[PDB]
Amino acid sequence: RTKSVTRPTGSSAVITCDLPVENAVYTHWYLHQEGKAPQRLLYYDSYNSRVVLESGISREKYHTYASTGKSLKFILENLIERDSGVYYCATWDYKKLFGSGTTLVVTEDLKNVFPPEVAVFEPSEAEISHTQKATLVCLATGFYPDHVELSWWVNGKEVHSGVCTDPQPLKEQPALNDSRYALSSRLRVSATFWQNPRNHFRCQVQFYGLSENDEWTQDRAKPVTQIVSAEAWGRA
Amino acid sequence: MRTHSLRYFRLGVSDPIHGVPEFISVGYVDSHPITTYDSVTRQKEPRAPWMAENLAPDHWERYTQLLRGWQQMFKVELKRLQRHYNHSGSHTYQRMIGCELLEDGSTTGFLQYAYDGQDFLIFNKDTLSWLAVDNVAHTIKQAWEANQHELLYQKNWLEEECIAWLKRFLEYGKDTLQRTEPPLVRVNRKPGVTALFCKAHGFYPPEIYMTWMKNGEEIVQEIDYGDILPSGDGTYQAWASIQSSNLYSCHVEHSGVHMVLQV
Amino acid sequence: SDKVTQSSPDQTVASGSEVVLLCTYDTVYSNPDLFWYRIRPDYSFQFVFYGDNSRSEGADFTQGRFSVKHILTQKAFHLVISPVRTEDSATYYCATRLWLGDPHTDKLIFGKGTRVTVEPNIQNPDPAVYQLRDSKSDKSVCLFTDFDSQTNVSQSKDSDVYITDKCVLDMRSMDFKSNSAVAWSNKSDFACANAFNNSIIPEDTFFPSPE
Amino acid sequence: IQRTPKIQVYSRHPAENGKSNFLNCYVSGFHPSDIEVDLLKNGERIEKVEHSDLSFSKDWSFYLLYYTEFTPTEKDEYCRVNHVTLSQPKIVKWDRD
């Protein structure tokens, strides 16, 4: 449910609320970053149809789009590197019910962005005999923006059980500024399931990249929002 | 750690004396009026300055509109009740809603409707139901209970909004609401045989307990109590009444404190 | 109204234990409204618990496993988890509610947050290092798995070899939880035997030979 | 089903002779809100009267308080209330105890 967006520096960004009720009289907007505490940024009042901000924020930094029947939207201007984070809409039905939220990352230089390459590694013959379980490994390499969503699909259906993905990636170049990343994921299933050739396994990485509005001036292909994937079949 | 209570009262009367209005609504934070709206002014305005200091005008605008609608609904409801009861002339219709935070820790919420001062319909927030006292009230119970969403709205307001409203109100007027003024206790002598009066006066929190006891032993309900009344300056007062040579003491408990006066 | 502080640092605990989260509020109100909220790795923002001086109410998902110690004299609002489960590893924040207008217009103030990691209990460790088959043919993958929660993973010595950290996966059908760590490199002198030489390797680690 | 009101006359402060004080008349427990209330000085109405705002009770009754500034002298004697529940306007005397 959580949405995600990658943007360049100096551009504007659009965020949509994900709440049980689309329209609320007062709708609040909070920002979360890894180190700092969550802070309220503003809240929209429908009766006065105006935004109420907090201290220390410019009046021409954020604004709101209020559709009659749709979920309200918040728009940010002049994106700075310190604006990266995750934004949540909130309301007060019984307590402060925060929405699914949306992640936002912004980058100064648009020539440093690369899409990830996805590879799938099949289980070892040693594990299949030592233990009755089988482990498939997914590796995504060479992506600069840490804005990816990884999923596993078995027989055409997304699987949530027996799958582990580390919460944070590692730097491909540990000492270089604006360095590319790498991420790993693991799926474990019964050896009976893996030995069946009928079963199809796929690792899908949703990469959040440039939009159609962004202009590309490089020899490489456009790092557009895409889905990279790798697949494998059962092998007795 | 004291029982505070937010309440809203609405009252209507059919064919009243032309001096008396037709509909009136008044709020209470600690039994002293906080707000007032009537059909003559058709405007909700505060009756306490500190509440007006900390509230935006749009609140008054919204609730003025809502109370206009509620006045119209109140009038039509009273007319329907008169039609059902075959009552002609002048009768009364009252509604009381609100919540209480008690000193023992428990919290309560209530919403009741009364006709001619007699109980007509009481809400049950835990059962989300209506207890009716009559078949005429049973008809209204059946009509209202159909709207589940409105009943859930009332219950959630009584359990999540009224308490919050009290929480902000007790801080907006903390000087006038959370203040404490100690009482002044005096003993009076004075038809052949007379008793000694124990009197307290000048306490803002109306919670007061008074007892007589001789050398640590209380009296067996022979203490003729007296009613508690307000002084008019924002304080209250009370009195109590209880030959042989016996020593007696008057014990009085106010908010937080127990004090004894000896003879 | 001004500040809320979380004194307890981020901690790693084991399943089945009791954990306490510390929080101190600096309020002006006499009966403040305090809240405990959590953020999961999937970034879900859900209400955990609510308390005032008089009352205490929790979320539906807690299921009696969550409690709060609210002591007024010490200004303390502590979270207690008597049974802890791996489904609770998350970042916890404590907040206070400030009223300024309509109740729907209030604000929540949060602490910096405490990160709690619930390691699983591996009853029968089988520490094993495997070499995964190179499907589609530019790296080779070594996997270390089935070790107890006490063993801690450390980074590699050479910068040309990439090693990840711990990972906990729960087979729901078999109700079986396992730990894992991945390693890869590009140099031709790279093998799974020396992959985790820079970490505290258990003595009973399986090192299978090419079958 | 109407209940007759309850009258209570007293003094704001301990009544000493020749001192400024406030006489209080507290009427409670009347269902109809249309009432007539007067304060009496030597059996005559005091026109320098003051009162609080009409209030509500949780038992569907009402209460009110009337007051004024005066000086008590033992020569002077000190509520007159008329209601629909009352056949005649009833009078209450001040006990000064």
Side-chain angles (χ1 to χ4, degrees):
Chain A
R1 228 57 169 95
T2 287
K3 295 146 293 304
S4 305
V5 57
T6 301
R7 294 304 300 173
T9 196
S11 187
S12 162
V14 179
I15 272 169
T16 322
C17 291
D18 212 341
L19 263 50
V21 176
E22 258 70 14
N23 287 79
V25 53
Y26 303 104
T27 85
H28 314 66
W29 206 34
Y30 287 61
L31 171 143
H32 168 233
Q33 303 169 281
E34 74 298 347
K36 295 184 175 71
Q39 323 163 3
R40 182 215 265 191
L41 266 281
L42 64 105
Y43 78 90
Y44 180 87
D45 181 2
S46 91
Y47 190 71
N48 287 295
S49 312
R50 54 172 144 100
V51 284
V52 179
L53 264 56
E54 317 289 295
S55 40
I57 319 163
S58 162
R59 192 45 188 255
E60 284 219 351
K61 171 61 157 181
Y62 313 123
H63 56 277
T64 303
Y65 181 23
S67 317
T68 312
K70 308 178 171 295
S71 281
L72 265 59
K73 318 201 162 189
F74 296 121
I75 306 100
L76 303 89
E77 315 173 30
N78 289 317
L79 293 174
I80 307 293
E81 303 94 350
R82 329 285 156 178
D83 282 300
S84 293
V86 50
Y87 299 71
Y88 301 84
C89 307
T91 191
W92 220 294
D93 182 37
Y94 152 78
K95 286 315 168 190
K96 215 161 201 148
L97 198 153
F98 293 72
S100 83
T102 169
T103 60
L104 161 69
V105 67
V106 305
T107 306
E108 160 207 359
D109 200 358
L110 270 201
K111 72 148 297 302
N112 298 349
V113 53
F114 288 81
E117 318 163 86
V118 178
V120 158
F121 292 81
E122 285 184 28
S124 176
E125 294 180 65
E127 155 171 79
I128 212 74
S129 36
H130 178 98
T131 317
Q132 285 328 108
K133 339 267 212 291
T135 313
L136 284 164
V137 161
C138 200
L139 268 194
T141 50
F143 66 105
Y144 166 65
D146 183 24
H147 213 86
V148 277
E149 193 208 330
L150 202 162
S151 39
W152 284 84
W153 302 75
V154 297
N155 287 353
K157 302 278 186 155
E158 194 178 6
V159 50
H160 299 86
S161 148
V163 53
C164 193
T165 321
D166 35 4
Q168 92 159 29
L170 76 167
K171 291 186 178 189
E172 267 187 355
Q173 278 312 317
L176 297 195
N177 206 342
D178 310 324
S179 161
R180 260 155 294 175
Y181 287 137
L183 184 68
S184 80
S185 188
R186 310 140 196 97
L187 184 55
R188 219 165 191 212
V189 79
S190 57
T192 321
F193 203 80
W194 157 259
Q195 296 286 49
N196 184 11
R198 215 277 299 172
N199 288 332
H200 179 220
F201 311 108
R202 181 173 60 98
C203 163
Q204 155 191 302
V205 182
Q206 167 80 59
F207 174 53
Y208 291 95
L210 276 58
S211 61
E212 38 274 76
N213 262 77
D214 307 301
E215 180 209 345
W216 197 236
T217 59
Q218 290 287 342
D219 315 328
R220 332 185 322 257
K222 187 183 192 49
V224 76
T225 60
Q226 56 196 275
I227 291 179
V228 193
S229 201
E231 72 192 37
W233 283 93
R235 178 215 266 177
Chain B
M1 336 304 290
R2 256 308 297 177
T3 305
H4 302 115
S5 69
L6 175 53
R7 284 141 292 123
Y8 286 107
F9 289 74
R10 318 209 292 234
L11 161 68
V13 49
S14 58
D15 221 296
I17 295 320
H18 298 291
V20 189
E22 267 192 351
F23 168 85
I24 174 177
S25 172
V26 168
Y28 297 100
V29 169
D30 253 344
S31 295
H32 37 105
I34 204 63
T35 58
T36 289
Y37 168 100
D38 51 88
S39 81
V40 199
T41 185
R42 185 159 292 101
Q43 261 273 9
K44 170 167 217 189
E45 39 197 10
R47 285 224 274 111
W50 51 266
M51 98 167 300
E53 180 187 353
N54 299 107
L55 290 182
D58 71 284
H59 174 282
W60 309 108
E61 303 168 352
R62 301 141 75 118
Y63 288 81
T64 292
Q65 283 294 107
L66 305 191
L67 264 84
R68 288 163 195 246
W70 294 341
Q71 167 187 345
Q72 181 253 327
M73 191 76 72
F74 217 77
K75 174 188 182 190
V76 56
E77 288 196 329
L78 170 61
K79 279 264 169 283
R80 176 178 311 140
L81 282 186
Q82 293 197 100
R83 162 162 48 259
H84 277 36
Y85 272 106
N86 227 14
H87 283 170
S88 44
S90 190
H91 304 252
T92 86
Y93 183 55
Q94 316 140 258
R95 157 198 163 146
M96 151 185 156
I97 192 171
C99 65
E100 297 169 7
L101 61 97
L102 263 61
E103 85 194 321
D104 65 54
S106 49
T107 67
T108 325
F110 33 82
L111 162 67
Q112 313 171 348
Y113 286 78
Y115 173 75
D116 271 349
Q118 317 292 299
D119 278 302
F120 199 62
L121 270 161
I122 76 164
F123 193 63
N124 196 330
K125 69 181 186 310
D126 306 310
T127 323
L128 282 91
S129 76
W130 281 91
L131 307 191
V133 310
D134 201 358
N135 46 32
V136 180
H138 202 351
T139 315
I140 324 291
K141 163 179 170 168
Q142 299 168 335
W144 270 348
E145 256 173 42
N147 194 347
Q148 211 159 338
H149 313 78
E150 84 175 0
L151 292 200
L152 193 130
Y153 169 65
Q154 314 208 255
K155 151 171 191 131
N156 228 43
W157 190 79
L158 296 168
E159 288 197 353
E160 294 285 315
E161 306 290 303
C162 173
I163 302 283
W165 277 116
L166 246 182
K167 218 149 287 188
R168 28 184 75 71
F169 285 177
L170 296 169
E171 211 78 9
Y172 285 160
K174 187 200 337 170
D175 41 13
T176 320
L177 268 294
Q178 302 216 241
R179 74 173 215 260
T180 313
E181 290 194 355
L184 202 284
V185 186
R186 295 280 62 230
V187 160
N188 186 4
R189 301 235 156 194
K190 186 203 307 185
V193 187
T194 56
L196 82 171
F197 293 139
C198 196
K199 294 182 188 167
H201 93 285
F203 52 104
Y204 160 63
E207 186 215 353
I208 197 68
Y209 290 57
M210 300 179 45
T211 46
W212 275 110
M213 70 196 326
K214 51 224 173 192
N215 323 297
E217 311 146 10
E218 311 97 300
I219 323 297
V220 189
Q221 307 151 19
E222 201 57 49
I223 174 171
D224 172 46
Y225 272 164
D227 301 336
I228 171 175
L229 302 166
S231 293
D233 66 333
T235 74
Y236 293 83
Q237 73 203 236
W239 74 266
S241 84
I242 212 178
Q243 198 182 327
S244 305
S245 301
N246 194 9
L247 182 65
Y248 301 115
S249 37
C250 187
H251 266 93
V252 63
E253 177 190 3
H254 199 251
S255 150
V257 283
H258 285 256
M259 42 200 51
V260 50
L261 176 53
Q262 312 91 4
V263 174
Chain C
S1 167
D2 185 33
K3 276 184 313 295
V4 162
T5 313
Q6 282 173 251
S7 310
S8 41
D10 38 358
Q11 43 184 310
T12 68
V13 83
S15 172
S17 167
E18 188 193 50
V19 312
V20 282
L21 294 155
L22 309 170
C23 183
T24 314
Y25 59 95
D26 178 23
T27 190
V28 197
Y29 318 115
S30 167
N31 191 106
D33 288 353
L34 306 152
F35 303 90
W36 270 104
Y37 273 65
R38 78 164 184 194
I39 283 171
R40 323 174 106 249
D42 82 325
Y43 292 138
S44 205
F45 212 164
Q46 52 188 130
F47 152 82
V48 181
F49 219 92
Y50 153 71
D52 71 4
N53 305 9
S54 174
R55 288 180 292 109
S56 210
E57 318 172 34
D60 268 336
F61 83 95
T62 83
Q63 314 204 283
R65 280 204 309 137
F66 284 73
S67 165
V68 187
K69 303 301 115 183
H70 186 205
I71 41 186
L72 301 319
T73 69
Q74 299 172 16
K75 260 29 187 164
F77 201 65
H78 300 306
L79 256 187
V80 168
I81 324 304
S82 180
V84 81
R85 294 207 260 251
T86 207
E87 316 101 42
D88 307 314
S89 310
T91 304
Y92 283 76
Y93 301 92
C94 59
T96 176
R97 169 187 199 167
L98 78 95
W99 31 89
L100 52 97
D102 183 284
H104 296 334
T105 57
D106 303 328
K107 178 187 183 182
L108 295 200
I109 316 176
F110 296 95
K112 320 293 168 201
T114 314
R115 308 89 199 268
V116 48
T117 314
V118 186
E119 289 175 339
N121 291 329
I122 292 94
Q123 268 259 12
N124 306 297
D126 210 350
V129 167
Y130 303 120
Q131 159 93 31
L132 260 75
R133 297 252 64 175
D134 42 355
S135 178
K136 319 298 180 180
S137 302
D138 187 41
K139 310 271 190 175
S140 317
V141 161
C142 298
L143 180 67
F144 178 36
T145 194
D146 314 326
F147 49 88
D148 59 343
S149 302
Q150 326 302 113
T151 312
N152 292 303
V153 197
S154 72
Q155 310 288 8
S156 49
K157 198 110 171 308
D158 182 21
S159 283
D160 275 321
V161 190
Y162 305 100
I163 296 184
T164 83
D165 221 297
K166 216 167 66 170
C167 210
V168 169
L169 52 150
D170 178 36
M171 309 207 221
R172 203 158 53 190
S173 73
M174 263 177 282
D175 202 354
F176 167 84
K177 303 187 188 64
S178 88
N179 292 344
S180 37
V182 197
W184 71 93
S185 167
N186 247 356
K187 304 200 309 167
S188 46
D189 51 26
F190 162 81
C192 300
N194 308 339
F196 307 89
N197 266 8
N198 208 12
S199 312
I200 42 183
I201 319 164
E203 264 174 329
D204 46 333
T205 40
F206 185 33
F207 276 77
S209 78
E211 148 176 345
Chain D
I1 316 105
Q2 42 200 21
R3 33 219 195 260
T4 167
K6 175 201 200 174
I7 324 159
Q8 275 157 112
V9 192
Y10 60 104
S11 65
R12 164 153 131 187
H13 273 75
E16 197 245 352
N17 270 280
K19 199 60 66 172
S20 57
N21 201 328
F22 292 81
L23 171 78
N24 288 341
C25 182
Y26 184 82
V27 182
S28 49
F30 52 101
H31 169 48
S33 82
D34 40 358
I35 49 93
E36 276 213 299
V37 52
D38 272 340
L39 292 187
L40 289 194
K41 183 180 273 286
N42 291 60
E44 310 228 7
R45 148 168 169 110
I46 296 188
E47 208 162 9
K48 202 223 305 190
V49 79
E50 215 175 358
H51 72 95
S52 164
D53 267 339
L54 179 61
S55 294
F56 290 113
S57 267
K58 93 163 298 299
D59 72 331
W60 312 123
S61 85
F62 308 78
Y63 71 87
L64 245 182
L65 182 70
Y66 271 67
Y67 58 100
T68 176
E69 186 150 38
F70 79 117
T71 281
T73 83
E74 292 230 0
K75 203 274 147 183
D76 307 333
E77 321 101 292
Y78 311 104
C79 222
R80 171 179 102 66
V81 297
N82 192 33
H83 200 191
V84 296
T85 77
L86 294 185
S87 310
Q88 64 198 4
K90 265 137 210 171
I91 326 298
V92 173
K93 291 166 150 60
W94 182 35
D95 212 2
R96 205 192 177 103
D97 293 5

